[PDB]
Design a protein around this ligand. Sequence first.
Ligand SMILES: C[C@@H](Sc1nc2c(cnn2C)c(=O)n1-c1ccccc1)c1cccc(O)c1
Ligand SMILES: C[C@@H](Sc1nc2c(cnn2C)c(=O)n1-c1ccccc1)c1cccc(O)c1
Ligand SMILES: [Cl-]
Ligand SMILES: [Cl-]
Ligand SMILES: [Cl-]
Ligand SMILES: [Cl-]
Ligand SMILES: [Yb+3]
Ligand SMILES: [Yb+3]
Ligand SMILES: [Yb+3]
Ligand SMILES: [Yb+3]
Lengths: 494, 494, 494, 494
Amino acid sequence: DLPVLLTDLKIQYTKIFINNEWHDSVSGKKFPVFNPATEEELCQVEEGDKEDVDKAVKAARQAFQIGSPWRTMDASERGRLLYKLADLIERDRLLLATMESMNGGKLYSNAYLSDLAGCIKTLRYCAGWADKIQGRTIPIDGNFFTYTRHEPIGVCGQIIPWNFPLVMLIWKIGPALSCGNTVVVKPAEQTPLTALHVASLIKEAGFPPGVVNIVPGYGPTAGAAISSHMDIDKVAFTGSTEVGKLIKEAAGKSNLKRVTLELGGKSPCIVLADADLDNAVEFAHHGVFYHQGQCCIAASRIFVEESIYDEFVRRSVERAKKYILGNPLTPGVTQGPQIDKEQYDKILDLIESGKKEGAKLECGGGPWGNKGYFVQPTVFSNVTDEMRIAKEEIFGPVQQIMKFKSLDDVIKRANNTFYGLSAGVFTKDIDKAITISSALQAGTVWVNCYGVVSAQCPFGGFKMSGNGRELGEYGFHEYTEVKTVTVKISQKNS
Amino acid sequence: DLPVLLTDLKIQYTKIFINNEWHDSVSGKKFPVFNPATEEELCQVEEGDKEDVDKAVKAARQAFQIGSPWRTMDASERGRLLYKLADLIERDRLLLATMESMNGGKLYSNAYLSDLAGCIKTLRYCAGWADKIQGRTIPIDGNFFTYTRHEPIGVCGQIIPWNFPLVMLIWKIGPALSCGNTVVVKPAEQTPLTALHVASLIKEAGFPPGVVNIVPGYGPTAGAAISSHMDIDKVAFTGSTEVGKLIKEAAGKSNLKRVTLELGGKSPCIVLADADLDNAVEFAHHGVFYHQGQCCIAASRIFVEESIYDEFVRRSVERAKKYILGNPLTPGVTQGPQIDKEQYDKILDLIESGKKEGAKLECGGGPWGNKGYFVQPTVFSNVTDEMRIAKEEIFGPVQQIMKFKSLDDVIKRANNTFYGLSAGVFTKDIDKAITISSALQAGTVWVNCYGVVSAQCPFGGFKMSGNGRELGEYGFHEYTEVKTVTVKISQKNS
Amino acid sequence: DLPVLLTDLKIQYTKIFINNEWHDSVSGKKFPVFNPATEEELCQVEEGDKEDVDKAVKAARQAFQIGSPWRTMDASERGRLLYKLADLIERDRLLLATMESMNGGKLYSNAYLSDLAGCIKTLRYCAGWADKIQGRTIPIDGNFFTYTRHEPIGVCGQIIPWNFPLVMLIWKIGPALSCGNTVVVKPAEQTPLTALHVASLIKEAGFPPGVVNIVPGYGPTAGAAISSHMDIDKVAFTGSTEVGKLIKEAAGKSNLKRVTLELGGKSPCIVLADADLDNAVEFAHHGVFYHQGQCCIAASRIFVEESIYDEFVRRSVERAKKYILGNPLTPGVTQGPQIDKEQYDKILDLIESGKKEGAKLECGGGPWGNKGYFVQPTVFSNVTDEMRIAKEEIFGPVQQIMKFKSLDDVIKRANNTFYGLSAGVFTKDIDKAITISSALQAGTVWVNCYGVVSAQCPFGGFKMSGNGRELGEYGFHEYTEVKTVTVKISQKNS
Amino acid sequence: DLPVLLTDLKIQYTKIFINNEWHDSVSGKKFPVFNPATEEELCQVEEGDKEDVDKAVKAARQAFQIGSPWRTMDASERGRLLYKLADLIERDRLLLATMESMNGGKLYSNAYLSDLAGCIKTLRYCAGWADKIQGRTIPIDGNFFTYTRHEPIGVCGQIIPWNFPLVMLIWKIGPALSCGNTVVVKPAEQTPLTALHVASLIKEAGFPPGVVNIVPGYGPTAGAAISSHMDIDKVAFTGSTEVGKLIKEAAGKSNLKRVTLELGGKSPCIVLADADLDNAVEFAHHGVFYHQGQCCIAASRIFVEESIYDEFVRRSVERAKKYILGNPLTPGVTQGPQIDKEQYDKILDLIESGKKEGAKLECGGGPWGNKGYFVQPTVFSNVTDEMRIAKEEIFGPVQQIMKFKSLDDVIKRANNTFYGLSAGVFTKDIDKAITISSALQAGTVWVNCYGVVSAQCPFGGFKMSGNGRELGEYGFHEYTEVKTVTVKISQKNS
Ligand SMILES: C[C@@H](Sc1nc2c(cnn2C)c(=O)n1-c1ccccc1)c1cccc(O)c1
Ligand SMILES: C[C@@H](Sc1nc2c(cnn2C)c(=O)n1-c1ccccc1)c1cccc(O)c1
Ligand SMILES: [Cl-]
Ligand SMILES: [Cl-]
Ligand SMILES: [Cl-]
Ligand SMILES: [Cl-]
Ligand SMILES: [Yb+3]
Ligand SMILES: [Yb+3]
Ligand SMILES: [Yb+3]
Ligand SMILES: [Yb+3]
């Protein structure tokens, strides 16, 4: 069932959120937020800069002080607040999905059924962990009692991307808050709006002031202020590998703050001759085209064994030809726009390289419409490994399909990238499934599926696709700081 | 490579081992130990009874007292002693394998290459855990510091079976000692000898006195004294399901001591039409015939899909016809005797039921030789589920082969037993492998193999095949007792 | 704040609960439920016997079948149902606390503020674990992929005591359901009513039918049917050590079902001369007198260093003299009745032994009132270790206070019992706190407090005070059954 | 007992170690290694540069390839090799301690009894973990089987400091190898020699070639080549905070390699009025003066409550006056030299600042001897927080003693530093011990002791004292890379 908002959406929250109150920018400057489907301005939002990041950090630091409400409340109560926040997001599901669709260029059906479902479920998952973060008692050598505390790290700067604004906001704040940290969030300049609504709900839920502070603004200004701040303990970032390198560099230069990155990919699929063919076609298809290709896990290199290659390419192309482009709020529409001009240009440029470097254009390959940043869904076959479309993350609706005959070699080709976020293996053979997935240098390996993400699983990159993991049990480690306490005693006993 | 002992084996250790010294029995009675291959007496061993179990428990209790060397030594040093003991067993590998072969009716090749390899490796595995047993620090509600201690339980009574005397001795003492317990071991009346050599090595390694006490004797006398003792904290037993019920009952009646049991099985294999056929034949074959069928995991019901049933039965029968019976010390011999008269009779009785109830005898089905408890390797095809050979653990070289056509039904037939130790699934299909192994009510499920046991894996039964698990991380839990310590504090912080 | 029910309580649910529907007993027999404060009958409830336990188990078995809604739903959804059930109990907090107070003889203030708070919080804690129960992937020797599944065990029989009916119901069903088990609950014959209301709420929450079945009735009839059933996989019991031995025995006799017991105690406190004296008095006081002494953890032996003994005894006695006896529903009342005749008699009998064996009666020592099972709060000083009041669990408002001068000896006296549920240590000295708590043979050791119980902590007995642990991470282990799956592969890699 | 080497030490291993063979440098250049006690050259060692780091990385990459001996061997066998290496280091204990003493300026007694003991024990600890590194099976939403692999990361660059060359070498390679990584080690330019002997032993133990490669040389040349290499997956570094920032920056600039740092400290002790005074004096003394102050954990700010300050300062000063300076190989000598000119100058410079800024010089404060880099043991009292000696890591035998009267304020002063490696709390009060240790922003907090380090504990910095943890269970996480494998299945069951 797909319900809708009965009256039109009004924008209410447009200010900087610090100590549970709404702040004008220090400068007094504001910046426009656009609908990528119409290119029309939706509203103006307060432009956070370094001076506003400073206010946000001071508030987060104060909320983190020993003896504060957030440090002293029961872990179970941190849990409770997070589950309350999930209930509120569920209450505002229609509003949030519509705002997400409108600001983010994201299909409403997907926004409502997937993004918001995952956002609520992931919050509820994280809430459950709050009072289950535990240290150890350790049988050290000598006459000592040794225990560890898995403390919160402290003030965590969190830079959110534009492709999944609500989901990524919750991936960040959910674990960070469950573990007892305070946060300074910088949502994407393209998509500040849903985060600012969430801030209103954080206040409503009863989080102590200063526990969550949200500072909208640009990357090079507010994002740089976060990455180079001398009193931010950790920075978490999702986005391009380029900006990832600037984050990690600036942390080293400033205060050696902890860094976790989720960056791009050039994720491969290997489709064996014995695979369920239309399952492999359908998952590889959705693997690359989901949300206009604007997924870090985009299945952007599909290697198919020679004897099934032609049939795979054909079936893929007919699937790509079924889309309806338009406003992502209109029902029946199955593909929205790209997020902005910068991305739009980058995609069309890379589409042209495929043409010039000699890939076989099967369909698409140009723009669409009078307004909006729309790219026709594009499929290239006979792609080769030194092509630009095979090396660079497109972040657009552009599928690459390659052939292989040797399994040894295709694994090398799959692994021959600086990326390593994810990969897909399609086969019916037990041994192939286990051995190939083990050999791929990818953080998530899907077998006979693609793009299956859930709160219970850790998620992140090998190589230049990232540092660290988010979600699962394992992801919660990176929002704690471990303290060993070693107490002299007269005599220990086992 | 298979080296041998250059001079003949002499028996040295035949006494009760308490506080690292050798004790005559309280009564002064001794009991004979036999070679099952010749039916000839090997030696006399001191007969432990209730009165000697009492001395052993008092010594174990004293070695466990707060402030004792065993309670106060570094965990890492418990580890060190265990790795030292492994080195000593490796030094005496030839001696121990020969004694194991001679007393246990066990093929020397297997004794030397498998039993002793596994015994050494499992000890070394357990040694590694000693200083890695850890409790927790817990974010309890209220202003409290809460931690847990994973303490040793205390005095652990450990009753060892005759089928794998050295291996099972080490499965018991390795984890128990790693965790800091003291032990009173009662090796099988049939096979006391290798345990008594190990005791000599425990002394040599430098274990504090009273940490390991070994009391040979009979089950109904010494084993009952252990199970009903008022100062034994835990009993661990491997053997028949019948005796398992008496152990668990007597613990309840006496002092509610902790109980873990590894009992029999009637373990099924399901062989799908798509399986690698000779791999399935070879593993199912070794699955049921290993060590004269005297394995709790014996693959004693092999269900084979109809279309490959005849070929499976044929190939199986030709494999069963390749054996050479005789003294397990002679090279080239590939099948030794059964352990004793009691077992020998039980097997022949059950072979006769198969005949009378209408199973198709494919080969074997009677005794062998002038001396020794030898049973011809026996294969029955067209076995049905209400036959005695399909319901009762034979513990002999007797294979049952059934047919099936429906996967739903064969899973019900596989699960339709009070047993549940293990099972085998043979297929090339990923989905079948995962779904079938999930649906089987068996503690270990092997896929495209059988009888793969290693120290890193937990091992134990569903249903009446046992309570608890041994080895792996998980098995170490059952040799600890958890204490929660909750300290009032003025103010907690996360 | 202490709100109350605005109209009088009516009893609605009095039937056996199986497959989410209300059943008359097979026999058609009913049994009375009494108010212990008035000795007046509250209602009649359907008397479950063996024949009704059988219906309940068959339903639980069907709800557990592979492919059923409960086996196939997401773990996260098991979590969701449990948090929903907590919300419903919170909605019915007034009703449930009043019914709990009225049926259980339990002070309303305590019922509302403590029992119901803990019940809701513990459910919410358990809900959080549902999708965080995980197995392992294990680096086994050889070319194999090995993983473990921490499966639900299956049908769990759960026998609930009368002292904390709602709390203990939730301690049982919360973990059992979180882990995926189905349950057959037998609440206490004295206190069936609040469990039957909870059943109505389980239906309301949307649990699949057969996942929770509640069968009220007597112990020797319905409780024995559970303990000896051939298709119940596990039994969990809280109550007397006497009945605990019968449970464990019958499990051994029937189907070797898994057993966990939380039994009585004779829990000691050691109060050092340097202790905060009135903190030690107040906690030791509440430690023994809470809920009319009807706590398994009753601090029923208080050892106080000689130099502070007289002052401790005096201060204790003046605290014991402050109580107001009466109907536990009336405000200002600070002590309700004992649960029934059987318990009432047992307490008065033991009070008389203290007198006859020569303890110094400081106050109390007889009955109270015209109606109700009231015992005056009783304090004995100069108690010695062979007295009946020092050895036997009274389960009544009867405090024992002893003296000691040697720390070595008082620890031996503390540990010189077959019990071992809990203990208390009162001192300002770091080393004493750590060394004493380590040396006590007690499952929970409180330091400078007593009776601090929370969902995040494991809880259970050493020795004859129990087998296994409930709650915490550690307690969830005993509601799983571990399966090892070992898959043959061509080549493994680390 | 302190045995010694019976003949004089000869230096044998002086070459670059790659693929288990000894390599001359690509350039052919060599660099001198000095004895800091005599300032005399001990030998020449091959100077590794970028070109030699490249050979080492290519070899490590090849040893890490899927299907290689190191990737395919049993985890238990990785364990075995590590325990074998420990046995070899134990065999060469005299040789290694003497070489360590001679090259490192380290007291022989300490080298033999502490450094080598810890090195052997830590290796044995790490060996135990090898086959106990496990992933998870995870109850993901939807019809999927999800598991994780805790894989080795790959090629790990490891830069070792000069203060504890053998110990730090083993802290690095032990966990890295246990987890299955290959390593390129760059020992300190001052202290290459003991690492090169260890390399000879790695070959002897039977490690596959390319698993450990050791490249001696300078920091700015070989260390920079490691930190900026495009095919090194992780860098681990121990040393100054200054160089730590350059490492973390260069990783960000090159290939976003994983980074863990153990950096300097300015570690505080808080000594309460109720503390055991001479225990606090003795531990705080050894806390700052151990190994000529060249410990990252140096207790370099000792805050003492006013009423015990004078007595503490006095007692401290008399302890500092007991030392005998000289060659660290001569028996009875209790203080050796500083490591080199650079460090020597830095210490004397900072000693002068204490004088000029107005600290009270209690003893020491200048150089010692005709040869060697000796600094007199120096004590400053009445130190204040803006003094250079209170802010900067001296890394020399220079003690700072401060006074405080307010506990709130002294905690702020303790925490008012960019450092945060460790701290010490001295008190008899339970509550103070727990609350203060919780409030300190330090990775290890010792209570009534100092400098207690063991393999079972995680160790590392808060703030600019480091990123990540070494040793313990927790430290092993940072030598794994987590892969999630999610397999589509027809139907899951719990
Ligand atoms: C000796 C084996 S255990 C083993 N190996 C077998 C059985 C049937 N076929 N094979 C090859 C078999 O039944 N076992 C066994 C023995 C006792 C308890 C459980 C299982 C072993 C391996 C690794 C470690 C260890 O301690 C023991
Ligand atoms: C109601 C308490 S349990 C509790 N609180 C007590 C006892 C004696 N004094 N106090 C204050 C006490 O005995 N219990 C208790 C009840 C059943 C089993 C074990 C312990 C609670 C707290 C948190 C969670 C929960 O489920 C229950
Ligand atoms: Cl994981
Ligand atoms: Cl496990
Ligand atoms: Cl625990
Ligand atoms: Cl830890
Ligand atoms: Yb345009
Ligand atoms: Yb005969
Ligand atoms: Yb009466
Ligand atoms: Yb000089």
